[PDB]
Amino acid sequence: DSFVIRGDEVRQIAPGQTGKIADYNYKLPDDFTGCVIAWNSNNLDSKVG
Amino acid sequence: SALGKLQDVVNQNAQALNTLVKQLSSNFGAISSVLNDILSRLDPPEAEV
């Protein structure tokens, strides 16, 4: 499952978490089995404007 | 007191039951002896523990 978020919300991508992303955007199950990988993409996803 | 023996038996049993009931007030290392407070306060991953 691939997507993009902001750094402060990376914590929300985990079982049993709450917040904007977890509640309304992407919710993992409490018994989630698998891995979560996140890396900064400021050079790629940022624009001067 | 002549029938002490019989009475004693009763007492012993009662004490057991009483003790059992009081054990419901112990946290046993948890954060609260009240199940509902644990459910409502912590996230499911740690409320499970």
UniProtKB/Swiss-Prot annotation, chain A:
Changing R11S: In strain: Omicron/BA.2, Omicron/BA.2.12.1, Omicron/BA.2.75, Omicron/BA.4, Omicron/BA.5, Omicron/BQ.1.1, Omicron/XBB.1.5, Omicron/EG.5.1. Residues 6-8 are annotated as: Integrin-binding motif. Changing G49S: In strain: Omicron/BA.1, Omicron/BA.2.75, Omicron/XBB.1.5, Omicron/EG.5.1. It comes from the Viruses. Changing N43K: In strain: Omicron/BA.1, Omicron/BA.2, Omicron/BA.2.12.1, Omicron/BA.2.75, Omicron/BA.4, Omicron/BA.5, Omicron/BQ.1.1, Omicron/XBB.1.5, Omicron/EG.5.1. Changing V48P: In strain: Omicron/XBB.1.5, Omicron/EG.5.1. Changing K20T: In strain: Gamma/P.1. Binds to host ACE2. RBD also interacts with the N-linked glycan on 'Asn-90' of ACE2. Cleavage of S generates a polybasic C-terminal sequence on S1 that binds to host Neuropilin-1 (NRP1) and Neuropilin-2 (NRP2) receptors. Interacts with host integrin alpha-5/beta-1 (ITGA5:ITGB1) and with ACE2 in complex with integrin alpha-5/beta-1 (ITGA5:ITGB1). May interact via cytoplasmic c-terminus with M protein. May interact (via N-terminus) with host bilirubin and biliverdin, thereby preventing antibody binding to the SARS-CoV-2 spike NTD via an allosteric mechanism. Attaches the virion to the cell membrane by interacting with host receptor, initiating the infection. The major receptor is host ACE2. When S2/S2' has been cleaved, binding to the receptor triggers direct fusion at the cell membrane. When S2/S2' has not been cleaved, binding to the receptor results in internalization of the virus by endocytosis using host TFRC and GRM2 and leading to fusion of the virion membrane with the host endosomal membrane. Alternatively, may use NRP1/NRP2 and integrin as entry receptors. This is Spike protein S1. The chain holds residues 398 to 446 of 1273 of the full protein.
